Ligand binder design. Structure first.
Ligand SMILES: CCCCCCCCCCCCC/C=C\[C@H](O)[C@H](N)CO
Ligand SMILES: CCCCCCCCCCCCC/C=C\[C@H](O)[C@H](N)CO
Lengths: 30, 224, 273, 241, 273, 224, 30
């Protein structure tokens, strides 16, 4: 993220973290 | 081993000899509100055994030309039991839910049901439930073929006769009112129509049973 | 972690009784688990396809039209050189269908305003965009005393300059925005009148947008303003089935009941393509 | 001050750009975020959830719009009759348009990976039978009989206690990615065909129904990927809202 | 320190004689000290709400209108293309009510001047803003010799350019500005004429603002200039009750005596909402 | 120091500036049923905050010729608040009680009251209480002069204006029904008659406030 | 604070220090 002001919500989107949890919706079986 | 099942909570028990395992909604068991999530300053009440038990709501019949039914939560229980009394005597409410749907037939019947839970079911244009008018678009302009993305189970008359869903508290606020907001709605739609030949029993009732889990109340006032 | 797609391992034929990957029981409610290397004879493939374009930020951080304001010279809408626009996103289908896939979202915003004459020509003129939070005094004319913007944020810009843009934080009292609200906002009896407030969530009413041409007398050009919105730092919860039928009203799932249409296309017979 | 120069790219508003802008509220702190179950971190997480497929998309009228979710099966003369066919192209308009995978794929130009279609039988307990499901790779036309369809990859489905079988459509292609197929030149990316054939019969004793139905659910495998985001081809408005 | 709001500790019931948190004696003149955890049964809450938006800088560092200058072509106010404006803040209600909450303030400033035609159109024209400290020669015409700005700061700018802005220090002989001055500025006898100087503080008269259109002959366009002010590095002392009635004159607490109005709204009975 | 007092429990608070200390009935604070005393097999419910709070019942006037009044416990609260709702939804009940009596007058009035608690008050021949007919014999054939052997306090108009009594659970059974048995009865009798001269305020109301402590319920069924 | 000139009064507002003394006005009792 690149920022030029004093507020964190004025920065760029940046690069997220590649994580997946496909079992939350596909395999919710106890 | 996942063919017989017994679920007990409070002072009620449910048994079934043809089950289809148990679906936990979004892979999270219900829990209490943590000290960091809370916003109220008054200590809440947790009646525990007196409001966490199985309730039987009503019976609906399955016909060869039925459309489907849906219910709303927790609107059904506001006039039933100690859960109803506490709901109208308190302003803030939170709880989980365990829902059990029963429908049994013989070996010579056929048909299939779609049991699903859809949070924030806004309907476009009580405890007894309503009947859908346009089941293809779920009465809200969305196709039913994509309903499986929500926690769901099937009732195939040749395989099982029951469906179990456990749903935690789903909302953007730690507490909310039980008389003005319905967290989710339960849907039961017949995808494959019932069929049998003349001479078999033509009455195939469907009954709904459910039980709140880990309830909490706050904000005492007069009954409204 | 899942930085790339999964590989495929070498497999051979299997003839044994008791283990059956193919047969399943979909009545349980869980998706399949049989893979390619368990139903056919496969080879070794080293997959290196990136999955970074399907993230929430990669899918929502694109600008879209959400607003339209007209400031005509002769007409009936805004003939006094000022306009008031309540902040809503549900005004246009392309963005609405995208954002309505989920139930709760939490995000910042970046707003860009493009202004020009109805014919597309650019003329020298000055304006003032004013953000009016709920409970603030809303202007009622071109020379209203509320235009002093003593506390409310405001922007002065000209047509000949590049379009102005600002960054916007998350201002909801709740923990996230919700596009569906199954309930009513008041403890009333809900006889008939309250039904016009069905689904009206106070947590989504963020304020009012005000625009005027800086001056005492009437201007000389008709003007149009277009508001574009872009999302960043996006989080989502609880996906729901996508929209099927046409839209009719803002903040309402109403649909045309007499004209109902299937999701896709149709053919003549099931045994023929 | 510092001497600079302007490159020929100034004053343009680019929609997909990532840039910095001046905040409007100095020193603002948002409401804290509580834990809400069911968070999505990638559109691929919910691209692997089975949804109902509309193989029998024949009817169109209002009162019978629900009949598109299943196709019938009954007893025949045991000559290997045909049941139903369709094209296995997720992005192309057709039966796949009714699934979540089909709708999401419309937002992305190119895709790659293996698909998976699951069939469920919803008949009486005393009805038995076997079916053959075949997938013809590109190049071969629609099979004219079962003995011609059995050449491609196929699976034999047996009715019983386990009422569901899954046919996996392996990723067989010449290119690393495929664009969306359509009639005309863009048929170069066609994936193939799927057919369902009677194996022996649909046998049923006396006192039991003679007609049953099958429900098909489709999803994607663990190596499914998409790229090059675009806009959908359908706009759900007919004017001002 | 106070970076966030206070938490709430767990409390239980108490039945004991001698300690009474509830009963108080407000005649002393000090606020209460009984808390939530001492009159009702409370739980544990971990408050993490920020208090950084209520600081003096966060409340005063927002621009506001303080001035207005007219340079008409035909009229009686300034028909010669030059104007003189004494620096005062009390000209407009929104900013005045905000700044009058306290008695003494000490701050820097950032001034922004926006210029355009009365209709809002922007035309190519050149001006000159000149700051005239007290005791400096004030211009009297468009071609006055004092416009050489040999020592006084001055700014040359065009209408088509973005609005000009400057930074301003604290120039008072005293230790802080004061908006109320209970006294007279001269040792005189105060018979009647001096009463027009009641409250006139010489420590607040900072100078004069001068504007003209650079040229020998009359210009071709009427022009309007708007002066906006923003505060930074703000300190305050001795708060006082806020204003109630309307304003009548600059630097005067006078109010309309015949039309006196209550602070808030009114109802019919005290036993009914 | 025993002249000012504040009592708080749940979400209610009571303050008084002229008190007469606090009497603990039989020198035992209320408590819960121990594991050795219990006889039931089902886990009881303890609503805690929702039923342990001060309730105001009714107001009775003090006249120069009054006889006296008495109430019954826990019969008064069976139609009031969450305590009432839980009482009719459960079969077994136990709890303690904290009782506060308020009656204030000026410095020129005079008179005295006798506040006492008598367990198992069998009457010989609701929430609003009854008026005694033969106060000398307590309407049960026993002299009132020996009533002080029970937990009691006095309200002397020249000294104080309130009386506080804390009473634990008194019975021969660990649990009992709240709709068929009244554990104790509260008595308020004017021993020294009220007196004042004409011109002073002639209305001297008496109001009763009380609060259950450490309640417990068991045996859920339908509301009766 | 960010500054580009030789004068300290031309800089930005910056971030203050979060301190409170509520007892000065609410509890001035000796
Ligand atoms: C220069 C001032 C202009 C800035 C004004 C924009 C700031 C507020 C934008 C709100 C962001 C979108 C969230 C709003 C709520 C929901 O989208 C809709 N009300 C849906 O009901
Ligand atoms: C380019 C030159 C323009 C700069 C002129 C502005 C500098 C002086 C501004 C004064 C700052 C406000 C303080 C003034 C005094 C009080 O506000 C009023 N006189 C109140 O009585």
């Amino acid at each position: 993220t690149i920022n030029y002001y004093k507020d964190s919500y004025a920065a760029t989107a940046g690069k997220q973290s590649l994580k997946q949890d496909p079992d939350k919706f596909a395999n919710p079986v106890k | 081993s996942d063919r017989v099942a017994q679920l007990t909570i409070g002072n009620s028990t449910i048994t079934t000899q043809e089950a289809a395992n148990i679906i936990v909604g979004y892979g999270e068991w219900p829990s209490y509100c943590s000290d960091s999530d809370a916003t109220a300053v008054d200590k809440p009440t947790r009646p525990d055994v007196s409001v966490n038990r199985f309730y039987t709501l009503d019976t609906k019949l399955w016909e060869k030309s039925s459309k489907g039914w849906y219910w709303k939560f927790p609107d059904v229980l506001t006039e039933t039991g100690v859960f109803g009394q506490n709901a109208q005597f308190h302003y803030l409410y939170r709880s989980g839910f365990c829902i059990h749907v029963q429908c049994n037939a013989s070996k010579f019947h056929q048909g299939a049901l779609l049991v699903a839970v859809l949070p924030e079911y806004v309907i476009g244009t009580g405890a007894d439930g309503f009947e859908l008018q346009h089941p293809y678009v779920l009465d809200a302009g969305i196709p039913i073929s994509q309903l499986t993305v929500c926690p769901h189970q099937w009732i195939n008359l040749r395989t099982n006769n029951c469906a179990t869903i456990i749903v935690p508290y789903i909302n953007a606020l730690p507490f909310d009112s039980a008389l003005n907001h319905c967290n989710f709605g339960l849907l039961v739609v017949p995808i494959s129509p019932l069929d049998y030949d003349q001479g078999a029993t033509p009455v195939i009732p469907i009954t709904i049973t459910l039980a709140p889990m880990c309830s909490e109340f706050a904000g005492l006032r007069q009954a409204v | 972690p899942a930085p790339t797609g999964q590989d495929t391992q070498v497999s051979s034929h299997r003839l044994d009784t008791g283990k059956v990957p193919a047969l399943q029981a979909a009545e349980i409610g869980a998706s399949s688990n049989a893979s390619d290397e368990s139903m056919i004879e496969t080879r070794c493939v080293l997959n290196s396809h990136s999955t970074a374009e399907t993230t929430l930020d990669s899918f929502f951080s694109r600008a879209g039209l959400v607003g339209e304001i007209d400031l005509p010279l002769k007409g009936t809408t805004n003939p006094n050189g000022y306009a008031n626009w309540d902040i809503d996103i549900t005004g246009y289908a392309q963005m609405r269908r995208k954002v309505e896939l989920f139930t709760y979202m939490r995000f910042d915003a970046e707003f860009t305003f493009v202004a020009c004459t109805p014919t597309g020509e650019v003329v020298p003129q000055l304006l003032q965009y004013m953000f009016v939070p709920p409970g603030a005094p809303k202007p009622d004319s071109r020379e209203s005393l509320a235009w002093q913007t003593a506390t409310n944020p405001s922007v002065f810009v000209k047509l000949s300059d590049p379009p102005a843009q600002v960054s916007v934080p998350f201002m909801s009292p709740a923990s996230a925005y919700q596009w569906f609200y199954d309930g009513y906002p008041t403890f009333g009896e809900h006889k008939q009148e309250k039904d016009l407030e069905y689904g009206a969530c106070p947590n989504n009413m963020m304020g009012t947008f005000s625009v005027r041409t800086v001056g005492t007398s009437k201007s000389k050009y008709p003007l149009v303003v277009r508001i574009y919105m872009r999302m960043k730092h996006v989080r989502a919860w609880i996906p729901r089935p996508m929209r099927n039928q046409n839209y009719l009203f803002k903040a309402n799932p109403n649909y045309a009941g007499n004209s109902i249409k299937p999701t896709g296309t149709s053919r003549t017979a099931i045994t023929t393509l | 001050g510092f001497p600079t120069e302007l490159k020929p790219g100034t004053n343009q508003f680019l929609t997909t750009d990532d840039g910095v802008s001046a905040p409007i509220l100095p020193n603002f702190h948002p409401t804290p975020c509580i834990h809400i179950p069911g968070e999505v971190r990638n559109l691929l997480e919910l691209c692997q959830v089975e949804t109902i497929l509309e193989v029998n998309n024949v009817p169109t009228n209002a009162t019978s719009l629900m009949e598109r979710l299943r196709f019938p099966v009954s007893a025949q003369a045991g000559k290997g009759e045909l049941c139903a066919v369709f094209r296995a192209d997720p992005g192309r308009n057709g039966p796949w348009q009714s699934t979540l995978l089909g709708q999401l794929c419309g937002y992305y130009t190119q895709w790659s990976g293996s698909l998976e279609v699951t069939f469920m039988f919803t008949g009486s307990f005393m009805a038995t039978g076997k079916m053959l499901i075949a997938y013809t790779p590109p190049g071969g036309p629609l099979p004219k009989d079962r003995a011609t369809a059995m050449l491609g990859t196929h699976v034999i489905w047996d009715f019983g206690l386990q009422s569901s079988v899954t046919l996996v459509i392996p990723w067989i292609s010449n290119t690393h990615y495929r664009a969306h197929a359509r009639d005309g030149v863009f048929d170069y990316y066609t994936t193939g065909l799927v057919s369902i054939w009677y194996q022996t019969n649909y046998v049923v004793p006396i006192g039991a129904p003679n007609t049953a139905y099958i429900i098909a659910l489709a999803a994607a495998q663990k190596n499914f990927t998409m790229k090059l985001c675009k806009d959908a081809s359908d706009i759900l408005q007919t004017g001002t809202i």
